[PDB]
Ligand binder design. Structure first.
Ligand SMILES: *[C@@H]1O[C@H](CO)[C@@H](O[C@@H]2O[C@H](CO)[C@@H](O[C@@H]3O[C@H](CO[C@H]4O[C@H](CO)[C@@H](O)[C@H](O[C@H]5O[C@H](CO)[C@@H](O)[C@H](O)[C@@H]5O[C@H]5O[C@H](CO)[C@@H](O)[C@H](O)[C@@H]5O)[C@@H]4O)[C@@H](O)[C@H](O[C@H]4O[C@H](CO)[C@@H](O)[C@H](O)[C@@H]4O[C@H]4O[C@H](CO)[C@@H](O)[C@H](O)[C@@H]4O)[C@@H]3O)[C@H](O)[C@H]2NC(C)=O)[C@H](O)[C@H]1NC(C)=O
Ligand SMILES: COCC(=O)N1CCC(c2ccc3ncn(CC(=O)N(C)Cc4ccc(C#N)c(Cl)c4)c(=O)c3c2)CC1
Ligand SMILES: [Ca+2]
Ligand SMILES: [Ca+2]
Ligand code: NA
Ligand code: NA
Ligand SMILES: [Zn+2]
Length: 805
């Protein structure tokens, strides 16, 4: 109930929202149908349009007009945005030369440069180049300020998850807005873009920028807008708030545009109809910049021009139907479209089996345009599992395609030609970032980066301490002229032990055998030096990783590799080795096929054992440092130490052996040497964070050997590939992966073929950031380099995407 019989007189676009049953006058009242009776009349004036003309100059004020051209308008803060241009001989902002903003040039009373965030829905990254001839204002912001060639959205690449990620610096799994459409099984409620349900605060987690600012005494309202408020009126409202008294005026502002997304869904990303919406958005930026220039704020404010996601070509006829795969299609509920999410129709149904649904959807048609996953099996880079609103069954849909339950869902609603929501590494889903103002750099291009990083930067821009979030604070310092945050390396929590030779062979009863008894002071001191760390500078190029939790571990040195060996998990946490361009690949000798050797530095009680692998009919083993890459037949014995062994399913060993025997050498050839760090990951509760010992759900049968959920590698070389990896003087280049440790290769439809036809494709799908591995391991990498810490943080957030240009 609303008593709509109050008034908006003197209250138009008020900042403090007033509580029902009293009527409202704020920018959201229309969405709630709760505006006062006279809101349209007083707050949504339209008379005489949005622009001054020559005949209107110095007019007598008429309060009915949409905006004003009278002499008093500048002091009232309510001129039309072109007033100085038409009536005072001023130039439009876009026609002015660009001039470096070295210091903020603000009116008296401004405590700090305001921040204006201009967000555009569906603004695909390539629009910046392809539409540049029709977007002169946007082109000036881009060429004069700081810009990236593209910005990576979060998955799913939908509106509400991405806009709220921009506001919070959190993954959708953490902020709770996991789709444009969501069902919560605990609320027994569905969230849609259309409807009142989305108004309930129970959906919205984390701490958005407006709340962060308000808590710290910086004034800021929410970033939402009612759709029916026209763009010209949103801009005039922002400019009027900027003319408020010092004690009343906000420091952060948000404009939102529904375009170009709206027309993109109808016409496709590059439909001829798309030129006009891009023109109209550019005109709106022009209105803002002209308005700022009138108020002498155009060299004071920091402006961020930012998109939520791009747009792909998608039509009705490119739809896969679940009724073509399943027979029981009426026992499921599907969230459809550019992603699929599947749950049971009824919770009273104990005859609902996710296993049988997955099997009936796996590699069933040769051209199949989607792939089913249990959520914990999705690529870890998506960070899309740790929330009750994310269904156990997920469908990853090919770009350009849709999934639907039954044909009747599609014709009983071709309409549309565009859509979005696909994997966030897809080129068509990439969006835009431009920063312009005193605090951003001048005429500067930055590498592509993830939208999760922006919350920290906006906090820096406003002098705020960020709430805990998923950005890496310092990784975007290169965007800023000043206000840089000074990041520092986390302190190491556990110091390693360095064990010497402490155990005789006969103390071990591991059930292992090796043909190694086949037997010089020249070469005995030599190998003693190797065991002491003489080759360590070759194989550990960036220092040892720091362990950021409490644990018991040993450093083990060898000719060809170094490791950090966990006495708790009975295997390395990390294994580090360098392979030059000139390195040679060899075989495992016949006599060494089943060789496993006790390590006389490590107790029998803290070792794995061969008998457990013999008894476990499902589980086999592999090695972290590959025997194929030994530097000599004598060094090869080190690779068969029990302390280099890890548990591996035979299906996974096909993947791992191909990576070790073929791909490491190929990368060494291409990149002029590589340094590799490899290791296990345990994430049984799919939270993206390292498991404690008591979270492990699976062991090698009848032992205390824990089974990893994933295996990682981090592959580093010189950015200047004319220098070898082990003698690099400048910036680094990295690619990394987090491969799921699965007992089948059901994910790869071509797995019955030779590894050369499917393994590398799998690895590409499971590409990762160094920072993702750090979360999953409690390790901190690149501790000892010649590079600045901010640069290393940028390197740790890099993702190698394997898309074209
Ligand atoms: C990305 O960045 C984010 C942000 O930094 C990282 O997420 C953080 O992870 C922390 C570790 O998991 C976690 O800290 C825990 O917080 C518990 C208190 O939780 C509430 O308070 C916070 C702070 O105000 C709030 O933000 C939380 O909000 C969540 O929940 C509501 C719904 O209730 C949502 O609206 C919101 O979207 C958000 O949901 C997300 O998080 C929850 C987990 O909290 C998930 O379940 C959701 O699916 C969703 O992802 C909460 O309202 C606190 O209780 C924890 O402490 C326990 O654990 C320690 C172990 O050290 C133990 O010593 C304590 O005793 C304690 O145990 C008690 O609780 C147990 C569980 O019920 C119980 O078994 C015991 O008996 C004890 O009573 C813990 O400190 C933090 O909340 C989140 N924050 C957010 C915002 O998500 C994220 O990890 C990053 N991702 C990556 C990959 O790096
Ligand atoms: C976290 O706080 C939640 C909260 O304050 N509320 C819950 C939500 C509640 C509410 C009330 C009325 C509304 N009217 C229109 N739209 C559309 C709308 O603005 N865009 C499409 C643009 C937009 C801009 C910023 C963000 C962010 N970030 C997002 Cl996601 C969307 C609402 O989304 C909307 C939301 C307002 C109260
Ligand atoms: Ca959108
Ligand atoms: Ca975990
Ligand atoms: Na076995
Ligand atoms: Na297969
Ligand atoms: Zn859309």
């Amino acid at each position: 109930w609303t008593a709509t019989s109050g008034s908006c007189k003197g209250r138009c676009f008020e900042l403090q929202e007033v509580g029902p049953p009293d009527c409202r006058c704020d920018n959201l009242c229309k969405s709630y149908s709760s505006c006062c009776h006279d809101f349209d009349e007083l707050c949504l004036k339209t008379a005489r349009g949005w622009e001054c003309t020559k005949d209107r100059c110095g007019e007598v004020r008429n309060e009915e007009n949409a905006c004003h051209c009278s002499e008093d308008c500048l002091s009232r803060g309510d001129c039309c945005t072109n007033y100085q241009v038409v009536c005072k001989g001023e130039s439009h902002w876009v026609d002015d030369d660009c001039e470096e903003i070295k210091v903020p040039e603000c009116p008296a009373g401004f405590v700090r440069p305001p921040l204006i965030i201009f967000s555009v829905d569906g603004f695909r990254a390539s629009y910046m180049k392809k539409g540049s001839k029709v977007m002169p204002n946007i082109e000036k912001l881009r060429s004069c300020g700081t810009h990236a060639p593209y910005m990576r959205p979060v998955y799913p690449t939908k509106t509400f998850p991405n806009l709220y990620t921009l506001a919070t610096g959190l993954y959708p799994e953490s902020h709770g807005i996991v789709g444009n459409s969501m069902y919560d099984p605990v609320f027994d409620a569905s969230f849609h873009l259309r409807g009142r349900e989305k108004f309930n605060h129970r959906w919205w987690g984390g701490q958005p920028l407006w709340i962060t600012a308000t808590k710290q005494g910086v004034r800021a309202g929410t970033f939402f807008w009612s759709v029916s408020i026209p763009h010209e009126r949103r801009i005039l409202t922002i400019l009027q708030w900027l003319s408020l008294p010092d004690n009343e005026r906000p420091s952060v502002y948000a404009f939102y545009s529904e375009q170009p997304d709206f027309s993109g869904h109808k016409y496709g990303p590059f439909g001829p109809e798309m030129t006009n919406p891009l023109r109209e958005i550019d005109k709106t930026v022009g209105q803002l910049m002209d308005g700022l220039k009138q108020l002498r704020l155009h060299r004071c404010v920091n402006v961020i021009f930012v998109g939520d996601h791009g747009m792909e070509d998608v039509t009705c006829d490119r739809t896969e139907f679940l009724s073509n795969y399943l027979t029981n299609v009426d026992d499921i509920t599907l969230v459809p479209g550019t992603l699929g999410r599947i749950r049971a129709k009824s919770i009273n149904n104990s005859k609902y089996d996710p296993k049988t649904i997955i099997a009936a959807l796996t590699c069933k048609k040769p051209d199949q345009h989607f792939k089913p996953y249990m959520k914990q099996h999705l690529p870890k880079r998506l960070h899309y599992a740790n929330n009750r609103r994310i269904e156990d069954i997920h469908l990853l849909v090919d770009r350009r395609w849709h999934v639907a339950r039954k044909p009747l869902d599609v014709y009983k609603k071709c309409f549309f030609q565009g859509d979005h929501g696909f994997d966030n590494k897809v080129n068509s889903m990439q969006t835009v970032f431009v920063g312009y103002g005193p605090t951003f750099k001048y005429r500067t291009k930055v590498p592509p980066f993830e939208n999760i990083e922006l919350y920290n930067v906006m906090c820096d821009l406003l002098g705020l301490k960020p709430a805990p979030n998923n950005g890496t604070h310092g990784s975007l310092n290169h965007l800023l002229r000043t206000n840089t945050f000074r990041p520092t390396m986390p302190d190491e929590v556990s110091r390693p032990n360095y064990p010497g030779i402490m155990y005789l062979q006969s103390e071990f009863d591991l059930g292992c055998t090796c043909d190694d008894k086949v037997e010089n002071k020249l070469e005995e001191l030599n190998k003693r030096l190797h065991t002491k760390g003489s080759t360590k500078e070759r194989h550990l190029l960036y220092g040892r990783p720091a362990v950021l939790y409490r644990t018991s571990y040993d450093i083990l040195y060898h000719t060809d590799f170094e490791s950090g060996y966990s006495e708790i998990f009975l295997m390395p946490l990390w294994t580090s080795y360098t392979i030059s361009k000139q390195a040679e690949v060899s075989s495992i000798p016949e006599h060494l096929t089943n060789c496993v050797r006790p390590d006389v530095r490590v107790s029998p009680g803290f070792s794995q054992n061969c008998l457990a692998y013999k008894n476990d009919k499902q589980m086999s083993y592999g090695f972290l440092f590959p025997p194929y890459l030994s530097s000599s037949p004598e060094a090869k014995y080190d690779a068969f130490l029990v302390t280099n062994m890890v548990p591996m399913y035979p299906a996974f060993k096909r993947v791992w052996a191909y990576f070790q025997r073929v791909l490491v050498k190929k990368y060494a050839s291409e990149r002029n040497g590589v340094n590799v760090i490899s290791g296990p990951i345990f994430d049984y509760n799919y939270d993206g964070l390292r498991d404690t010992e008591d979270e492990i759900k699976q062991y090698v049968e009848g032992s205390s050997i824990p089974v990893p959920t994933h295996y990682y590698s981090i592959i580093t070389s010189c950015l200047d590939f004319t220098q070898p990896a082990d003698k690099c003087d400048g910036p680094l280049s990295v690619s990394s992966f987090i491969l799921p440790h699965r007992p089948d290769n059901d994910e790869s439809c071509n797995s019955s073929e030779d590894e050369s036809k499917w393994v590398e494709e799998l690895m590409k799908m499971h590409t990762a950031r160094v920072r993702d591995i750090e979360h999953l391991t409690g390790l901190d990498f690149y501790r000892k380099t010649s590079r600045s810490y901010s640069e290393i943080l940028t390197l740790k957030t890099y993702l190698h995407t394997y898309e074209s240009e």
